[PDB]
Amino acid sequence: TENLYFQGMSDVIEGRLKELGFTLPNYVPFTISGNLLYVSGQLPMESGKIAVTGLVGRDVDVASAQRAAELCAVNILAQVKAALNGDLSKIRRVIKLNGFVASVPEFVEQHLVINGASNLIATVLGEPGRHARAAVGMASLPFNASVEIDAIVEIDV
Amino acid sequence: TENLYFQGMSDVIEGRLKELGFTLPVAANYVPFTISGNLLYVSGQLPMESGKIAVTGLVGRDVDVASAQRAAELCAVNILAQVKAALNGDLSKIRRVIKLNGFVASVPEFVEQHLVINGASNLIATVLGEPGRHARAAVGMASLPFNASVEIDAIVEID
Amino acid sequence: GTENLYFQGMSDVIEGRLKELGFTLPVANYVPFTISGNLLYVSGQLPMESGKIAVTGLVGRDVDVASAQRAAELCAVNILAQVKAALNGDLSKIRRVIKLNGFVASVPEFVEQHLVINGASNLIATVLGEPGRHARAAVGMASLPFNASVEIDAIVEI
What we know:
Order of helices and strands of chain A: HEEEEHEHEE
Oligomer: homotrimer
Domain Endoribonuclease L-PSP/chorismate mutase-like (chain B): 14-149
InterPro entries (chain B): Endoribo_LPSP/chorism_mut-like, RutC-like_sf
Strand content of chain A: 25-35%
PDB class: structural genomics, unknown function
Protein name (chain B): Endoribonuclease L-PSP/chorismate mutase-like domain-containing protein
Pfam family, one (chain B): YjgF_endoribonc
């Protein structure tokens, strides 16, 4: 019964993500300590490729970087689902996102870029999706990703 | 009585901050802080003073170390304002400042980000005493939201 | 009793494995670490060797990947020294390295910060084994204190 409830809750979360246009795809993607889930920096992977590359303010505009952040967030959710054995309803609260945005020094709208991730997360999870955050401008990122985002998530354990 | 003691402890914290030259300010799908167990995660704070970003541009180009240190202090005061909010008015319910991440907008020749973040660290340790002493990272960023010179987030263990 | 000997043994093994990789452990209002519950937060460590910053400048300009990888190893060695201090001499009391944040001083064309931080990740996993496997971020910085090429912080369950 209550496992059907949690299955249902997970279905609703993943369905809301599909309504936004996304399906879920020596260091590890995540670790757990107590009831905190540490997710490694995720890149904007889509179909096994970095979807958005280069510097925001040079190679990529805010709208494209927002999609990058959305993809990072989708990849975070993918890892959380795997961490929780298929059940995104075992998320109690997204505690923190760290949003790293590859930026030229004149680009100062990293907060708008990371809004791509924050809005998607809050939209699919509701109130438990609302999180603390940092949004910062980086010189560059692995594989020339435009955005990398890590997460700390409080989970039902 | 315990409540009076805690109000007193908070008055002392905020009074120390005034002696340093600062009053606490009053200051979406992201929030200024979250709490998990007895850990308070405070979002990255910018050098806000009177609702304005007080120090902007790149350290080593637009701003020098002294100005950047003031920026770090302001970030720290904004952190303290969020913690006060989180603890319903009571900065005495801080058990330990666990970590600050100090992000300093830097030209690549600028390599004194530790000195910049010392602005925040010194202010926090002064106002809070031993419980203010924290782990830290200090790093140079290409740029920051609103062209802030410094942004600083925090994790604080609370009562 | 011998439970204490057992932990002493495990720490010997960890430090010995580190020496096999060619490193020994080295010996303010901010501190090198704090503890909350069973979580140890270690401050950003620089590539310190014999009291000096061993590797300086921007990866892709002043230093190549192999040199940066050695910086990242030194950062990890310094993380382990702090952890050893935090645990009163006992690296065996590490339960899990939860997270490393790897900050690499980078020119904007340099995009192999994952390979740089692999220096630290591989060393940590080697000397600690399974408990050394950690979550991670690897990012490119404009510059770092003292012109370090790499700075790394850590959260460790103890």
